[PDB]
Curated annotation (Swiss-Prot), chain A:
Changing residue 85 to A: In strain: Alpha/B.1.1.7. Residues 23-73 are annotated as: Heptad repeat 1. Disulfide bonds join 135-146, 185-229. It comes from Severe acute respiratory syndrome coronavirus 2. It comes from the Viruses. Residues 52-96 form a coiled coil. Changing residue 53 to N: In strain: Delta/B.1.617.2, Mu/B.1.621. Changing residue 204 to Y: In strain: Theta/P.3. Glycans are attached at residues 177, 201, 237. This is Spike protein S2'. Subunit of the fusion protein that is processed upon entry into the host cell. Mediates fusion of the virion and cellular membranes by functioning as a class I viral fusion protein. Contains a viral fusion peptide that is unmasked after S2 cleavage. This cleavage can occur at the cell membrane by host TMPRSS2 or during endocytosis by host CSTL. In either case, this triggers an extensive and irreversible conformational change that leads to fusion of the viral envelope with the cellular cytoplasmic membrane, releasing viral genomic RNA into the host cell cytoplasm. Changing residue 221 to H: In strain: Alpha/B.1.1.7.
From Swiss-Prot, chain D:
This is Spike protein S2. The gene is S. Changing residue 14 to K: In strain: Omicron/BA.1, Omicron/BA.2, Omicron/BA.2.12.1, Omicron/BA.2.75, Omicron/BA.4, Omicron/BA.5, Omicron/BQ.1.1, Omicron/XBB.1.5, Omicron/EG.5.1. Precursor of the fusion protein processed in the biosynthesis of the S protein and the formation of virus particle. Mediates fusion of the virion and cellular membranes by functioning as a class I viral fusion protein. Contains two viral fusion peptides that are unmasked after cleavage. The S2/S2' cleavage occurs during virus entry at the cell membrane by host TMPRSS2 or during endocytosis by host CSTL. It comes from Severe acute respiratory syndrome coronavirus 2.
Length: 250, 191, 241, 49
């Protein structure tokens, strides 16, 4: 599993030396982040608002349907066994036809509420079935589809009529300003980075990767040549080190 | 109109929506897509597009050696949006239809008040001033049965139509997150 | 009015057949009929768990037909205007949201969208992070709903022969509400099928939990429970009633 | 008074048209209000040309 997260960091452009050189740090930032889920669950009852609303909106629509039986609908009494015991079958069929017309309209109102509400849950189950496949069983490059930040992995948890994910996301925290430049003249050639950008702490230039400050000496293994200096807007001067040169110097 | 058909105002005014689409717009321009991940990180915009070209497999020497060309192909492409908007009124057909299909369904609901539904007159104050309360309760029970069916028809049209907009807002909320705040590798999801 | 009737015309009507203008049958002038001022009354309140104090929103009137604050949604009475801008707590409409704060009362305010933050942009300045954090967010989705089924005969005409014979005259209104509530209740077993049952086999953890130093014991199942559910699954099963 | 005989047909059409009108403030909430702060442009617009 220490080699799984090094795949997961490669999926977000962070070179896997960030993982192994900080494995005890990420183990304590991951375990302490699980430990804050419980204190975000064992105290705040409003965390489960999307799932308690599914239970509430159906116990509401049944307890509205049951209370429709106590309505007269124009008839003399809402109790059907009180019309049959107090009226004659020529007259009683007028009163009962007002209740059947009234109650059957109350079912068609209820079923139409259920077809539309179950078309909302199916659109929220196919969203959950997409987040199960693309975000648990893989790693998603879709921004803010799997929690705010660069996504690493998810862990599903069951829930009463629903699913709860634990999106484990990578979020960059502590920054520094840097004077950058898109290009470097060395001998008139314009060296561009293979992976990352050029920065400078103020005196010397370094190529580093995009999402974690890891400065490296600018060599020809980091940079590739294209064209010459006269075209790129913002090119700076620097020496670009050559690894092959001190080999053949000795 | 006066028949209890109020229109509630939206929560977010049109000035506040034009502050989110400046905050979503000044973060895309100045900070790349890192304002969607964590804190916004400034980056020169000529170096943002070199990330964006690396996302589509084009080596970033294409950008810097053709930066004045892309600046004139991008500015002239914004300039054709206005001439595609300031003349063709049928460009906004998906949004004018949302306004039309709701002013249609209210002006069908209001015109249901002029129907007799079997009763002698569609004016309820003309039954009460012309009939006796044993007989008038027969006529009014035809209007209440008729008008309440016209509301349940209207609300059922609104629940189904608002389930179409929510499926088109969650598509817009997906294109806001995956396509403004990042770069999408999904073909023909973003133009 | 300025509605110039013709000298044979008596009533002016609306779209909805109600009379909009009449002609006075003694002094022949033309009179509009505007119905009297009306509007919805909404009661903005915090919970009665907190307080019993309310503030009343008269929807879509002015503050004449009735501390007294004016919105674009109507005349808000009972809530104090505050120049400060907070996050939205009880949404009113047209940018105003109300809340219960501190000596305590209900305040109303133009809501705030977030803290203003100008990015220190320039044409050669990049801001690369030096350190990170691993945040575990939680996303909670509904999957299924309650599989109900309504007996269309026992609901309408419960234990009555004289009513069930009248129900047969309406035809198949009964035998399609049992079909529509079955077509829901089938796919509620398909929604739970598609979300969870994607793995073809049932994998299980090795007995030694040396996952690089990480600690998954708060999400893996607990064998000491009678239903072998995790610790976080047991917190979720007690927060939903 | 005749409408009260039908029961809660009134008090569920006001609930169904509120359950729409709440999420119309949630649709605009989910689409636009995704950014946590309000960023604004620098006063000098040298965005690469």
């Amino acid at each position: 599993f220490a080699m799984q997260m090094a795949y997961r960091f490669n999926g977000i452009g962070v070179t896997q030396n960030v993982l192994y050189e900080n494995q005890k740090l990420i183990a304590n930032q991951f375990n302490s982040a699980i430990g804050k889920i419980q204190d975000s669950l064992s105290s705040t009852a409003s965390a489960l608002g999307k799932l308690q609303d599914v239970v509430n909106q159906n116990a509401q629509a049944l307890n509205t349907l049951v209370k429709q039986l106590s309505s007269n609908f124009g008839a003399i009494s809402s109790v059907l066994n009180d019309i049959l015991s107090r009226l004659c079958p020529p007259e009683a069929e007028v009163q009962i036809d007002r209740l059947i017309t009234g109650r059957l309209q109350s079912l068609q109102t209820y079923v139409t509420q259920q077809l539309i509400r179950a078309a909302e849950i199916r659109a929220s189950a196919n969203l959950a079935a997409t987040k199960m496949s693309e975000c648990v069983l893989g790693q998603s490059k879709r921004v803010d589809f799997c929690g705010k930040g660069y996504h690493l992995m998810s862990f599903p948890q069951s829930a009463p009529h629903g699913v709860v994910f634990l999106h484990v996301t990578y979020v960059p925290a502590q920054e520094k300003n840097f004077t950058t430049a898109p290009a470097i003249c060395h001998d008139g050639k314009a060296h561009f980075p293979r992976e990352g950008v050029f920065v400078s702490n103020g005196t010397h230039w370094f190529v580093t990767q995009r999402n974690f400050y890891e400065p490296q000496i600018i060599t020809t293994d980091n940079t590739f040549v294209s064209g010459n200096c006269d075209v790129v807007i913002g090119i700076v001067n620097n020496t670009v080190y050559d690894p092959l040169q001190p080999e053949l110097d000795s | 109109k006066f028949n209890g058909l109020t229109v509630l105002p939206p929560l977010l005014t049109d000035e506040m929506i034009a502050q989110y689409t400046s905050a979503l717009l000044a973060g895309t321009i100045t900070s790349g897509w890192t304002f969607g991940a964590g804190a916004a990180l400034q980056i020169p915009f000529a170096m943002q597009m070199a990330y964006r070209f690396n996302g589509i497999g084009v080596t970033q020497n294409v950008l810097y050696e053709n930066q004045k060309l892309i600046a004139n192909q991008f500015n002239s492409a914004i300039g054709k949006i206005q001439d595609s908007l300031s003349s063709t009124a049928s460009a906004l057909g998906k949004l004018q239809d949302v306004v039309n299909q709701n002013a249609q369904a209210l002006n069908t609901l209001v015109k249901q008040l002029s129907s007799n539904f079997g009763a002698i007159s569609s004016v309820l104050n003309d039954i009460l001033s012309r009939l006796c309360p044993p007989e008038a309760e027969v006529q009014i029970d035809r209007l209440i049965t008729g008008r309440l069916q016209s509301l349940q028809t209207y609300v059922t049209q609104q629940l189904i139509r608002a389930a179409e907009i929510r499926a088109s807002a969650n598509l817009a909320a997906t294109k806001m997150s995956e396509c403004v705040l990042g770069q999408s590798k999904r073909v023909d999801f973003c133009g | 009015s300025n509605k110039k009737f013709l000298p044979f015309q008596q009533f002016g009507r609306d779209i909805a057949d109600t009379t909009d203008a009449v002609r006075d049958p003694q002094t022949l002038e033309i009179l509009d009929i505007t119905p009297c001022s009306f509007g919805g009354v909404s009661v903005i309140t915090p919970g009665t768990n907190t307080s019993n104090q309310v503030a009343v929103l008269y929807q879509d009137v002015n503050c004449t037909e009735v501390n007294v604050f004016q919105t674009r949604a109507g005349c808000l009475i009972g809530a104090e205007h505050v120049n400060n801008s907070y996050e939205c707590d009880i949404p009113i409409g047209a940018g105003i949201c109300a809340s219960y704060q501190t000596s305590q009362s209900i305040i109303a305010y133009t809501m705030s969208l977030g803290a203003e933050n100008s990015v220190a942009y320039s044409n050669n300045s990049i801001a690369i992070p030096t350190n990170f954090t691993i945040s575990v967010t939680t996303e909670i989705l509904p999957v299924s709903m309650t599989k109900t089924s309504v007996d269309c005969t026992m609901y309408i005409c419960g234990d009555s022969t004289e009513c069930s014979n009248l129900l047969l005259q309406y035809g198949s209104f009964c035998t399609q509400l049992n079909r529509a509530l079955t077509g829901i209740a089938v796919e509620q077993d398909k929604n739970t099928q598609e979300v969870f049952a994607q793995v073809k086999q049932i994998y299980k953890t090795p007995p030694i939990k040396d996952f690089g130093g990480f600690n998954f014991s708060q999400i893996l199942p607990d064998p000491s429970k009678p239903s072998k559910r995790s610790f976080i699954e047991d917190l979720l099963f007690n927060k939903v009633t």
